[PDB]
A paper describes a structure:
Like IscB and Cas9, IsrB contains a RuvC-like nuclease domain that is interrupted by the insertion of a bridge helix (BH). Previous work has shown that IsrB associates with a roughly 300-nt ωRNA, which guides IsrB to nick the non-target strand of double-stranded (ds) DNA containing a 5′-NTGA-3′ target-adjacent motif (TAM).
To characterize the molecular mechanism of ωRNA-guided DNA targeting by IsrB, we analysed a ternary complex comprising Desulfovirgula thermocuniculi IsrB (DtIsrB), a 284-nt ωRNA containing a 20-nt guide segment, a 31-nt target DNA strand and a 10-nt non-target DNA strand using single-particle cryo-EM. The structure revealed that IsrB extensively binds to target DNA through a 20-nt duplex between the ωRNA and target DNA. Mutations disrupting base pairs in the pseudoknots abolished the DNA nicking activity, and subsequent mutations restoring base pairs in the adaptor pseudoknot partially restored this activity, highlighting the importance of the pseudoknots for ωRNA function. These structural and biochemical data show that the ωRNA forms a compact, globular structure achieved by various RNA interactions. The TAM-containing duplex is bound in the cleft between the WED and TI domains, in which the TAM-nucleobases in the non-target strand are read out by the residues in the TI domain. Analogously, in IsrB, the TAM preference can be modified through alteration of the hydrogen-bonding interactions between the amino acid at position 326 and the fourth nucleotide of the TAM.
Numbering used by the authors: 6 to 210, 225 to 347
The structure:
RNA sequence: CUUAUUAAAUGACUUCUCGUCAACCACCCCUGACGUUGGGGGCCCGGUUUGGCGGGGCCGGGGGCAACUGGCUGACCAGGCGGCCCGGCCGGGCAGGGGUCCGCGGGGCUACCAAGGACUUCCGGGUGUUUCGCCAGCCCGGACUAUCUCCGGCAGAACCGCUCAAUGCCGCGGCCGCGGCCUAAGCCCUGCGGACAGCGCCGAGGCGACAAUCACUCCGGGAGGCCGUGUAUCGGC
DNA sequence: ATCAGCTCAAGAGAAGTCATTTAATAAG
DNA sequence: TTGAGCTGAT
């Protein structure tokens, strides 16, 4: 196991051992820290030598989930898996339907204006902006704590003109130029063909393994089966839909969404909670209200653990946007 | 790299409307005290007529066992903002004057650096869970008309409403000698009648930050290399 | 008097037109 | 995807 180290100037250093991590914290020379992805690291409180060896990052994008791996010049140091749960198209469809009904029943007749709705600069649909921004944040937060010098990614391609079914390629092809533009600001980029990915996978023998095979290809590092495996997913909430849509008996509409409501906790926050004499660490599914004076907490995969008394919940970290999960 | 063809992804405007909830009126049915009056119900699902969607009229079945419906009004983010009015920037409010589409008609103009506006361009504003902050989308104002972006109609077409359905037809110029004259189904303005609204616009979308984040093994507070600035997988024994 | 376990319901669609980004191919 | 209702228990 290795602990990432970050210098007083904000550069990543080379990773150190857990023993050095312990003693640097104990002696007060460095502060322990967690990344936005929850990865533990240490920030120095002293200048130290800045010499580092090569480190490379690989990202193998999928539609539903991605593989990520980090390798030193010697070995793979990390494997990870990233989930993006495809929530935005339904949310935009429901918002569109509600807008259409609202305008129908609440506005006069209005002119149809569709001929000249020009778009200025580069454009992406909200779903593709969502997935690009998530993948960029993952990469950008990995490059924050590791001395990444090279980014490796497969350049997905599909012949849409000859096969109509290609949905799960379109969702990853679209937005690639913005991704590649943003990648090159972090580190030098090596694009990889799908055939090269296949060849390296078959040579060396969870899709983080495929991203690791792209590393073993480009940089020749050894495989590391003992490397830790992490699961990360973007947190999803009902951000502005404050109430349920259909009026129920006597015309009531129950409240639904909102990430903040003037309380202490907020839905993205990471918390430790007690219930039935047992301790849980999780993320705030639900907020206290005048009637429902409980905090809903969910596990790393987004399923609610339960509802908790607000006295028994301790705030660990405010919303990072991600959950995290180490796989034993 | 410009333009085009095919195919995916998912964003916008508009029309038509389902779905949910609530109140009142009219009619019908079961049942109760003695036609007056009182409790409750009058519901669903599938098929069909159309190019298609929603009403309506038919066909059939379920579930009740009681046969099986009309009219009309209000609500579906919380709220925010603009126009104008009344009282004294706070309180209350929608009278006036605006917005769009359709039918018939008129005035001025022009043939693509068009007619001359704006879903063009530039600047700015409203809205957009919030602890703070940013963005997408929509809408609006002023300044020009921006290094150029955009501007139509008929049939099919009906039991009704809407719709550029598949398809078919027209206009996107004509005439003369690059230039000139003329003229629209194109551009600007506008009259009378009808439709939507009852004063309008935006509200169910994406995200950043937060030090409360103190780890990993292993013993029973400590251990899990010393040095090259107490980083290092690189170098040194 | 309040903690914990278990349960419940939850808005959706046709059509006209238009617009980006990413393929494979044209033609310049 | 999340607030809220209901019950049993101490
Ligand atoms: Mg707000
Ligand atoms: Mg047609």
């Amino acid at each position: 196991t290795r602990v990432p180290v970050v210098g007083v100037d904000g550069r990543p250093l080379m990773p150190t051992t857990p023993r050095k991590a312990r003693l640097l914290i104990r002696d007060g020379l460095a502060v322990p820290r967690r990344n936005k992805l929850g990865l533990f690291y240490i920030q120095m409180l002293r200048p130290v030598g800045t010499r580092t060896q090569p480190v490379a990052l690989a990202v193998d994008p999928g539609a539903k989930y991605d593989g990520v791996a980090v390798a030193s010049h010697r070995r793979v140091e990390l494997r990870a898996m990233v989930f993006l749960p495809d929530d935005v198209p339904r949310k935009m469809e429901t918002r569109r339907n509600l807008r259409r009904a609202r305008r129908y029943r609440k506005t006069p007749r209005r002119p149809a204006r569709f001929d000249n709705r020009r778009r200025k600069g580069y454009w992406l649909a909200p779903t593709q902006r969502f997935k690009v921004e998530a993948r960029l944040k993952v990469v950008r937060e990995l490059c924050r704590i590791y001395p990444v010098q090279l980014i490796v990614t497969e350049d997905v391609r599909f012949n849409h003109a000859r096969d109509r079914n290609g949905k799960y390629f379109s969702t990853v092809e679209i937005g690639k130029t913005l991704t590649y533009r943003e990648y090159r600001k972090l580190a030098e980029l090596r694009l990889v063909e799908v055939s090269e990915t296949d060849a390296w996978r078959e040579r060396f023998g969870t899709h983080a393994n495929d991203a690791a095979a792209m590393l073993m290809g480009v940089t020749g590092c050894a495989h590391n089966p003992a490397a830790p495996f992490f699961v990360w997913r973007r947190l999803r909430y009902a951000r502005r839909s404050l109430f349920r849509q259909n009026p129920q008996k006597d015309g009531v509409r129950p409240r639904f969404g909102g990430t903040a409501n003037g309380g202490f906790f907020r839905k993205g926050d990471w918390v430790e909670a007690e219930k039935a004499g047992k301790v849980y660490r999780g993320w705030v599914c639900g907020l206290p209200t005048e009637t429902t004076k409980l905090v809903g907490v969910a596990d790393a995969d987004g399923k609610r653990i339960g509802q908790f008394s607000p006295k028994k919940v301790r705030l660990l970290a405010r919303s990072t946007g991600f959950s995290w999960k180490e796989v034993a």
